[PDB]
Amino acid sequence: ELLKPRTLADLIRILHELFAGDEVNVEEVQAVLEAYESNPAEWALYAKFDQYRYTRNLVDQGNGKFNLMILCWGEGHGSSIHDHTDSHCFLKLLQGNLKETLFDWPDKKSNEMIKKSERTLRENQCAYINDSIGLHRVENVSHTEPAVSLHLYSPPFDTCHAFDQRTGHKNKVTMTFHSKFGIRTP
Ligand SMILES: [Fe+3]
Numbered sequence: 001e002l003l004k005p006r007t008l009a010d011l012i013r014i015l016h017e018l019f020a021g022d023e024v025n026v027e028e029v030q031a032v033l034e035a036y037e038s039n040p041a042e043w044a045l046y047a048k049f050d051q052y053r054y055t056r057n058l059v060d061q062g063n064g065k066f067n068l069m070i071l072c073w074g075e076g077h078g079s080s081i082h083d084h085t086d087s088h089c090f091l092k093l094l095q096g097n098l099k100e101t102l103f104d105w106p107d108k109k110s111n112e113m114i115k116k117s118e119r120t121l122r123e124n125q126c127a128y129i130n131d132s133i134g135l136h137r138v139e140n141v142s143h144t145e146p147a148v149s150l151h152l153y154s155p156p157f158d159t160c161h162a163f164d165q166r167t168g169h170k171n172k173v174t175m176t177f178h179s180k181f182g183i184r185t186p
Helices: 008-018 026-035 040-046
Strands: 055-060 067-073 088-095 098-103 117-121 126-129 135-139 147-154 159-163 170-174
Touching: 008 026, 008 040, 008 055, 026 088, 026 126, 026 147, 040 055, 040 067, 040 088, 088 098
Parallel strands: none
Antiparallel strands: 055 067, 067 147, 088 126, 088 147, 098 117, 098 135, 159 170
16 A cells, blocks of 8 residues: 655655565555655755765665665766666656656667667656666756755665766776765765
8 A cells, every 4th residue: 555655754664665575566666756745854964965066865775675865966967877786776856857868778889879868857756767778867957956866776786887978888886975864974
């Protein structure tokens, strides 16, 4: 029985129920994430920005089944084209807008990675991606509005690959958390 999360804490409790087992009902997780109405007071603790690039702020470790984090994107901040390390990845906008550009997996031959499509994710919308679907880049293209997004990855992962748009070549990157449970972790 999927009920509307009343608060971020309620959403976290519901997610612990949806990940109690070994598999993931993607549509139900996406539905509950989308149904939570962003309330800035509830996540202010995690909204720690950096002037130079987006930050990753861990909110919950999902009893080992998933990492729930909040990403804070300053104006013009964006990610690399990347994969998701054989994990499910849900992205819900809490504030602002983000541009998501989708790319297919490159072939072994060096070549320009041409985008398949792009879309604007708006406040409260939840997107989903996994390696079977493809790769993506996420960017806050706004010149005046910082963006904040809520991400859930299952299983949790600490590394992924960044892809060079000019060649398709990839390199392993290790993800680092700017804060954990509201505490800056330098
Ligand atoms: Fe991603």
